[PDB]
Write a protein that binds this ligand. Structure first.
Ligand SMILES: *[C@@H]1O[C@H](CO)[C@@H](O[C@@H]2O[C@H](CO)[C@@H](O[C@@H]3O[C@H](CO)[C@@H](O)[C@H](O[C@H]4O[C@H](CO)[C@@H](O)[C@H](O)[C@@H]4O)[C@@H]3O)[C@H](O)[C@H]2NC(C)=O)[C@H](O)[C@H]1NC(C)=O
Ligand SMILES: *[C@@H]1O[C@H](CO)[C@@H](O[C@@H]2O[C@H](CO)[C@@H](O[C@@H]3O[C@H](CO)[C@@H](O)[C@H](O[C@H]4O[C@H](CO)[C@@H](O)[C@H](O)[C@@H]4O)[C@@H]3O)[C@H](O)[C@H]2NC(C)=O)[C@H](O)[C@H]1NC(C)=O
Ligand SMILES: O=C(O)CC[C@H](NC(=O)N[C@@H](CCCCn1cc(COCCOCCNc2ccc([N+](=O)O)cc2[N+](=O)O)nn1)C(=O)O)C(=O)O
Ligand SMILES: O=C(O)CC[C@H](NC(=O)N[C@@H](CCCCn1cc(COCCOCCNc2ccc([N+](=O)O)cc2[N+](=O)O)nn1)C(=O)O)C(=O)O
Ligand SMILES: *[C@@H]1O[C@H](CO)[C@@H](O[C@@H]2O[C@H](CO)[C@@H](O)[C@H](O)[C@H]2NC(C)=O)[C@H](O)[C@H]1NC(C)=O
Ligand SMILES: *[C@@H]1O[C@H](CO)[C@@H](O[C@@H]2O[C@H](CO)[C@@H](O)[C@H](O)[C@H]2NC(C)=O)[C@H](O)[C@H]1NC(C)=O
Ligand SMILES: *[C@@H]1O[C@H](CO)[C@@H](O[C@@H]2O[C@H](CO)[C@@H](O)[C@H](O)[C@H]2NC(C)=O)[C@H](O)[C@H]1NC(C)=O
Ligand SMILES: *[C@@H]1O[C@H](CO)[C@@H](O[C@@H]2O[C@H](CO)[C@@H](O)[C@H](O)[C@H]2NC(C)=O)[C@H](O)[C@H]1NC(C)=O
Ligand SMILES: *[C@@H]1O[C@H](CO)[C@@H](O[C@@H]2O[C@H](CO)[C@@H](O)[C@H](O)[C@H]2NC(C)=O)[C@H](O)[C@H]1NC(C)=O
Ligand SMILES: *[C@@H]1O[C@H](CO)[C@@H](O[C@@H]2O[C@H](CO)[C@@H](O)[C@H](O)[C@H]2NC(C)=O)[C@H](O)[C@H]1NC(C)=O
Ligand SMILES: *[C@@H]1O[C@H](CO)[C@@H](O)[C@H](O)[C@H]1NC(C)=O
Ligand SMILES: *[C@@H]1O[C@H](CO)[C@@H](O)[C@H](O)[C@H]1NC(C)=O
Ligand SMILES: *[C@@H]1O[C@H](CO)[C@@H](O)[C@H](O)[C@H]1NC(C)=O
Ligand SMILES: *[C@@H]1O[C@H](CO)[C@@H](O)[C@H](O)[C@H]1NC(C)=O
Ligand SMILES: *[C@@H]1O[C@H](CO)[C@@H](O)[C@H](O)[C@H]1NC(C)=O
Ligand SMILES: *[C@@H]1O[C@H](CO)[C@@H](O)[C@H](O)[C@H]1NC(C)=O
Ligand SMILES: [Ca+2]
Ligand SMILES: [Ca+2]
Ligand SMILES: [Cl-]
Ligand SMILES: [Cl-]
Ligand SMILES: [Zn+2]
Ligand SMILES: [Zn+2]
Ligand SMILES: [Zn+2]
Ligand SMILES: [Zn+2]
Lengths: 694, 694
């Protein structure tokens, strides 16, 4: 039989291991020859694996690179202008890679050039609330200062935007051992911790879903009209550079001015964590000087797009996509995900060679330039937006398969919750102590949902990966899954070696997943989801799950507003319309579900499958959210304070945020009421797509 | 048999006549009780005719009405402030209607209040080029002047925007006999010409597709958040009022200052048509004073929505819609169209009672508040936009059925050209001299297309009617048809009694269509189109017709640009990408057509029908045109100079318009290039929707 079990049994840990080794021997930085060569390799292998068509889709997009002959670094300079301390020019390469060339040195992609000199201010994680504390409570002014911020908690681009709005003239980002060194584990190569010379690369754009900075809304093709750099979307206006904690300790240890306001501002280095500005008495005439000489350059990138044509509904697309470009070797990010995709294509291709085809078309994508702002997936989606919005069933992302070895992690639209529960009950747990038990059982035990015992946690999607254009711009049901750490016992962020030269094949094979069993489990989950979405007669979406979450989110945003009861009375701010819409959605979804379970008629089937497919689409508002036109989903958007986190009812949440500080409360509360109307209208409109059609 | 011929034979001229008489005995102004009563009547009759469901959809939208106890008028005032001449307070009512109450006096809907006094400037038709001639050539300054403009040539709202941008402090609109009095015909009630006391009502908004001024983007429902008047969309900022030519002659005859620049500025009154400003010597101390006291008021409106559920594809909608609200009795506009709709519903309902249903759902709409800015159709479309964009097959409008008795007039998307040619060849000509000949034959003979002998003219859609939201915002294939005048021998605009109290049942029955044969023919065309769209197995759209027109429009916009060959060299302005896209569309459309003619498979059928339905949809750009976010179609938009006229490649056309006058040519030509890229990308993207799907 050609069924899901055939598909799943064909997947092999040993193949994932071979592919991961093959993908991680040299760097594959976006825009470089090595990454184009890997694109061509994947294209060739996907054809040989059996796909119907495999093409490269290229675009010319703005990328950013250091200057090879004028390196970036930071100094402490004395009053004569002598540079008495310089930060490292590169991370010490790991064992056996000390002769690899083309390792890009640490830098903040898209930083402008500059050599600002000034006094330091330490701003903790540079979150909105850290700047509130400095400015409103401590009365410290960042204007014209260089800010030093520890990485962690929020996306680094939000940190830079926050520093820029505080008036900083430069930003220094560093990895504190508090956030990137797990107690009792050794530094690489002897364990999976970040050494003191390790540094996290990463872009600092604030694109808000735009894709290539020069061509928002349209693909960066051969004839595209490009904005000038001055009108580009999302570029920072002050220089930024990241460093490791050996160098950070040298910059922090001399800090004077005010003490940290409390312990949540103190990391683990043996320094006071004084906020500044500037250095203590003896060193008060020294300054910090940045030297940034990176250049932005329009550069060609290549996505690989593989198609497995559907047998019955070839005009319905189920997409499995993840990126191929890496900062250096990409041992976890992205190649542990790309190796899994490669083995999924291989298994579907084995069935295809035996005469099978899925019911719907499956598209497989190896995206480029994800690390520079989701550029490859976004430009391809801009090019293909009309096909995707009328034909796109679902998008499953496939970046890193592992960021720990403790339990499963899934983030997805509520429409896929039931599919995920059902699939995980049919899969074997790879965990020690749960041999013979389902993945659902081990996941639920290790990661209980806050809401319902006997259920596992499933998070909302935010952003910071290639599902963003599909979900938040286009309204295509999306999901992602990976193995993760124990979040209770682990206070570090992501994994310690994230975006460092130390993320290697050896890291994964020695410390994370020697048997490749967690990779295999992730391949089964991602692949199983794609198989069900592409093969189930009725799409495997449950609209009743959206009804349950919408009520939860309406309760949550109502509770935020009710912190301001006098203003709600004064301005007549009512959530009645929103709860009415959610009640109506609940009722209509319940009736739709009964019809779905109660109808030999392929027109009623497909009519019903179209209602299921366009339900996520109904949450899109073609006018976008305020000042963020490419975030169009009214229920979910990336948080305005942290692109990685999803926010629910984002339009109302942002209208309420810090509202007690607004100088015109009438205007501010009017905008809250406007966002409640938009949300209530959209929920009701989405509900009505599920009503009988005529 | 239940076929198109059964449907068409059931239509009766005598029924259209009875319904027109019934709809035109009292005024049905939007927002008034009489119009709500007619809504309820139509709803009841449509149910009795056999529709499956007939509902009212109400909204609360901004309307505008004169003050019953403080009438609007214009005066000439002497230097003492004595009003020595006043314009009429009402049109003399026609015979037998002198006791009808609730006839709204002439006014410009949405005019602000004011009593400006000043010197007159005569501005011909107040078109963009008339203001160019006054300002650039004649050096006449309109700043702080009252402008008097003759109606005709362009939408009155464009006239007001133009006057407002010239700095006028008020606008007086009047009907010149040159444009509203056909030589050799008598004034009403003895003929169909406009008498000297007749006045054309009409709104002066510039909504650019927004619908209700207070709720752009969202339906004006029970909980809507409304903008304040100061932020309302499209309201004029200076007072405006319309008058007839008896009163206009009294305002013009004293005009001094400069002579008219040439004969195209002279109408038919016995006055010099001097441009002014102000009056000749003896009268030079007199001024003109307006008194406008109209009020804008949020007011409930009601659409009637009837559904005839499809037998096979109930989730595909073919919509026949036209408005019900009138300025006064609405003898032509809209009741000659609404009577036709009523008889179409009756005929479909007869077949339905005999057991028939159409293949797809047909929706029938009686829209409200069309006269105040397309408000009823736009608010309903805003409410239902998700259903319409995923399910909407086509929209056929049904405003006035006649504006002359000479020949057919059709304006529609190229996708319906073949359908219209085929249908008209099967219909009987009602014209004298063509008895026994097809409507296609008489239409082609009387209204040849400029492009191909043996073919009839079919115009592009612009705006100024209820198809606007469906076509230009949502991208649903749309069309309209009516009987019209001989345009060569007739130099007047629209029909003379347009929007006057004289548009009555007697006007139509005595002068336009005594036998109701032109109405019947129009019912056959509109109804026949709806029948084919709702019943053909394969949707009756020919994509190859779009390819032919796209080439014509690309040639046209290239020719405009080539008036500036030096700038095209300097700024490297190339149309190569656009012609490439059009060539590719031509090739792909040809291959799609062969597949369409060459495939028992209902999935391939519906897949192909979906490609046909979403082809018009593919021309939509979700970012809209510049500063006009609700005009989203890239091939067609209402002209920025005349809402009634369609413009092709509007984004490029407006970037090129008057470009030689722009102060920064680099910037201006860059915007041309940007619009060429947007257009070429959209044409290619639309073509690719017709490629094989996987
Ligand atoms: C959830 O679904 C329900 C349908 O089950 C839907 O209920 C609808 O609510 C609207 C808004 O309340 C109702 O609107 C009323 O409609 C009647 C005519 O049918 C009007 O006469 C009412 O207006 C009068 O009363 C108003 C309220 O006090 C006055 O402000 C106004 O000036 C008028 O005097 C009013 O417009 C509608 O009838 C029901 N529809 C039903 C029951 O089918 C509800 O709106 C949905 N929720 C959301 C968020 O959409
Ligand atoms: C109409 O349809 C045709 C397809 O039949 C489509 O043709 C495509 O044109 C693009 C743009 O010209 C071609 O792009 C080239 O692709 C190759 C790789 O396949 C690249 O190497 C080329 O780039 C090099 O050369 C450029 C041009 O001088 C340089 O600027 C650049 O730096 C590189 O050196 C170039 O990107 C594409 O191959 C074809 N596709 C085909 C033939 O399938 C055409 O684009 C369509 N029209 C529109 C308006 O979309
Ligand atoms: O330009 C861009 O937008 C991104 C380009 C690039 N992209 C990435 O590098 N993306 C990485 C981002 C690495 C994430 C680092 N990170 C994660 C977070 C946390 O937010 C995640 C959302 O919460 C869901 C996790 N929830 C839990 C799951 C399990 C659990 N448990 O106890 O088993 C507990 C959980 N929990 O939240 O307590 N903060 N930082 C990726 O997506 O894999 C970049 O960010 O530089
Ligand atoms: O708020 C709004 O947007 C509108 C609300 C209201 N709406 C209307 O009143 N709509 C009327 C508008 C009345 C039209 C008056 N008018 C028409 C025109 C001409 O533009 C029409 C586009 O050209 C197509 C006609 N082409 C020809 C057809 C036949 C023919 N022949 O020789 O047989 C020749 C043609 N031709 O162009 O030479 N200028 N003014 C309606 O749509 O019926 C209003 O305008 O105040
Ligand atoms: C990764 O695996 C690929 C595919 O097996 C290797 O590429 C092949 O190399 C052999 C020997 O050089 C060639 O004859 C084939 O033409 C290649 N196949 C391709 C590109 O599809 C590649 O050598 C491996 N890379 C590493 C670092 O092990
Ligand atoms: C930090 O780096 C800078 C730049 O290379 C060093 O200063 C340079 O030193 C060389 C040789 O002494 C001089 O010729 C250049 O004039 C200096 N350039 C600048 C910009 O100062 C500095 O010596 C280094 N400091 C430490 C502690 O290593
Ligand atoms: C998840 O599995 C459950 C349990 O099998 C499915 O729910 C059943 O679906 C069948 C088939 O329609 C119904 O007849 C049963 O009554 C359902 N049982 C319930 C709701 O407890 C559910 O459909 C699956 N979800 C998917 C595939 O998305
Ligand atoms: C227009 O026609 C309608 C429908 O025939 C007339 O309304 C009917 O009036 C009769 C007699 O008053 C009533 O008993 C019915 O209840 C009405 N039917 C409806 C409203 O559907 C109406 O009188 C006619 N109007 C004019 C001006 O002739
Ligand atoms: C035009 O109308 C105005 C307004 O009604 C007339 O002026 C008014 O005349 C009455 C009676 O003579 C006075 O009591 C008011 O004071 C006047 N109002 C204003 C605003 O002037 C004027 O007489 C009329 N002119 C003509 C020629 O009929
Ligand atoms: C308009 O009528 C023409 C002539 O009948 C139709 O064109 C024919 O369509 C049939 C059926 O597919 C083809 O086999 C013929 O070859 C076509 N003849 C031609 C192109 O000359 C055309 O499809 C009709 N258009 C509609 C209904 O939109
Ligand atoms: C890199 O090094 C120096 C900086 O001025 C110079 O030789 C060259 O222009 C730089 N390359 C760039 C800016 O791309
Ligand atoms: C911070 O310092 C700058 C530079 O001197 C000054 O212009 C700015 O207004 C100050 N702001 C506050 C809040 O102190
Ligand atoms: C792998 O699992 C073991 C067992 O709990 C754990 O102690 C170790 O920390 C894990 N490795 C990683 C990288 O998390
Ligand atoms: C109409 O007439 C006068 C104008 O001031 C006044 O009695 C009443 O307020 C007006 N009605 C309005 C403005 O709606
Ligand atoms: C027109 O007249 C006004 C008012 O005196 C003046 O402000 C304006 O600038 C003038 N413009 C031109 C072009 O003469
Ligand atoms: C109706 O037709 C006759 C015959 O040509 C024509 O002379 C008359 O002008 C027409 N009536 C109208 C209103 O156009
Ligand atoms: Ca782009
Ligand atoms: Ca609205
Ligand atoms: Cl992922
Ligand atoms: Cl019409
Ligand atoms: Zn990644
Ligand atoms: Zn990454
Ligand atoms: Zn009308
Ligand atoms: Zn009208």
């Amino acid at each position: 039989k050609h069924n899901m079990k055939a598909f799943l049994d064909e997947l092999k840990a040993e193949n994932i291991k071979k592919f991961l080794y093959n993908f991680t021997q040299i760097p594959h930085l976006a825009g470089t020859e090595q990454n184009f060569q890997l694109a061509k390799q994947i294209q060739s292998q996907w054809k040989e694996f059996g796909l119907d068509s495999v093409e490269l889709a290229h675009y010319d997009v703005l990328l950013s690179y250091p200057n090879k002959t004028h390196p970036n670094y930071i100094s402490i300079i004395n009053e004569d202008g002598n540079e008495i301390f310089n930060t490292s020019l590169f991370e010490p390469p790991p064992p056996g890679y000390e002769n690899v060339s083309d390792i890009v040195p640490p830098f903040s992609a898209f930083s402008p050039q500059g050599m600002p000199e000034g006094d330091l201010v330490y701003v903790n994680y540079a979150r909105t609330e850290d700047f509130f504390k400095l400015e409103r409570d401590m009365k410290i002014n960042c204007s014209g200062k260089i800010v030093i911020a520890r990485y962690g908690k929020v996306f680094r681009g939000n940190k830079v935007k926050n520093a820029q709005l505080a008036g900083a003239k430069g930003v220094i980002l560093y990895s504190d051992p508090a956030d990137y060194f797990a107690p009792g584990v050794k530094s690489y190569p002897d364990g999976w911790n970040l050494p003191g010379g390790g540094v996290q690369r990463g872009n600092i754009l604030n694109l808000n879903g735009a894709g290539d900075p020069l061509t928002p809304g349209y693909p960066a093709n051969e004839y595209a009209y490009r904005r000038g750099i001055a009108e580009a979307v999302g570029l920072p206006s002050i220089p930024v550079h990241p460093i490791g904690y050996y160098d950070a300790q040298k910059l922090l240890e001399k800090m004077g001015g005010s003490a940290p306001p409390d312990s949540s501002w103190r990391g683990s280095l043996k320094v006071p964590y004084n906020v500044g500005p500037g250095f203590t008495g003896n060193f008060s005439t020294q300054k910090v000087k940045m030297h940034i000489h990176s250049t932005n350059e329009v550069t060609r990138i290549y996505n690989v797009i593989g198609t497995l044509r559907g047998a019955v509904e070839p005009d319905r697309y189920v997409i499995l996509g993840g990126h191929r470009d890496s900062w250096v070797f990409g041992g976890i990010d992205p190649q542990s995900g790309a190796a899994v995709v490669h083995e999924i294509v291989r298994s579907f291709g084995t069935l295809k060679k035996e005469g099978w085809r899925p019911r719907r078309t499956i598209l497989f994508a190896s995206w480029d330039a994800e690390e520079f702002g989701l550029l490859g997936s976004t430009e391809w989606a801009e090019e293909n937006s009309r096909l995707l919005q009328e034909r796109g069933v679902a998008y499953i992302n496939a970046d890193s398969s592992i960021e720990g070895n403790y339990t499963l992690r899934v983030d997805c639209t509520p429409l896929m919750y039931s599919l995920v529960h059902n699939l995980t009950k049919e899969l074997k747990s790879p965990d020690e102590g749960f041999e013979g038990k389902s993945l659902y059982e081990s996941w639920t035990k290790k990661s209980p949902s806050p809401e319902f015992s006997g259920m596992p946690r499933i998070s909302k999607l935010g952003s910071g990966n290639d599902f963003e254009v599909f979900f938040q711009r286009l309204g295509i049901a999306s999901g992602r899954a990976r193995y993760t750490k124990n979040w209770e016992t682990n206070k570090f962020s992501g994994y310690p070696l994230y975006h460092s030269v130390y993320e290697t094949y050896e890291l994964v094979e020695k410390f994370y997943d020697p048997m490749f069993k967690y990779h295999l489990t992730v391949a089964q989950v991602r692949g199983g989801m794609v198989f069900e979405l592409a093969n189930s007669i009725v799409l495997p979406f449950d609209c009743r799950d959206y009804a349950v979450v919408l009520r939860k989110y309406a309760d949550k945003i109502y509770s935020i507003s009710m912190k301001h009861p006098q203003e709600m009375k004064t301005y007549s701010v009512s959530f009645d319309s929103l709860f009415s819409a959610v009640k109506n959605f609940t009722e209509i979804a319940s009736k739709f579900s009964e019809r779905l379970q109660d109808f030999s008629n392929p027109i009623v089937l497909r009519m019903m499958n179209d209602q299921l497919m366009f339900l996520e689409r109904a949450f899109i508002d073609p006018l976008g959210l305020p000042d963020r036109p490419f975030y169009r989903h009214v229920i979910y958007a990336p948080s305005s304070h942290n692109k990685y986190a999803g926010e629910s009812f984002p339009g109302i949440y942002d209208a309420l945020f810090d509202i007690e500080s607004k100088v015109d409360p009438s205007k501010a509360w009017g905008e809250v009421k406007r966002q409640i109307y938009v949300a209530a209208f959209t929920v009701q409109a989405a509900a009505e797509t599920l009503s009988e059609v005529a």
